[PDB]
Amino acid sequence: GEKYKVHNPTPLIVGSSIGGLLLLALITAVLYKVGFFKRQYK
């Protein structure tokens, strides 16, 4: 609509945005397992 001609990609931002949740959730789970979030020193 507006100078929305950046094309406010529906495919790239929505598709990319998911990748953020892709990487984030996956990384967080790995860290938990290795006990990283188990935070040392108890």
UniProtKB/Swiss-Prot annotation:
Localization per Swiss-Prot or TrEMBL: Membrane
Tissue: Predominantly expressed in monocytes and granulocytes.
Placement of sequence motif GFFKR motif: 35-39
Free-text domain note: The integrin I-domain (insert) is a VWFA domain. Integrins with I-domains do not undergo protease cleavage.
Quaternary structure, from the entry: Heterodimer of an alpha and a beta subunit. Alpha-X associates with beta-2.
Organism domain of life: Eukaryota
Descriptive protein name: Integrin alpha-X
Primary role: Integrin alpha-X/beta-2 is a receptor for fibrinogen. It recognizes the sequence G-P-R in fibrinogen. It mediates cell-cell interaction during inflammatory responses. It is especially important in monocyte adhesion and chemotaxis.
Membrane-crossing segments per the record: 12-32
Family according to the record: Belongs to the integrin alpha chain family.
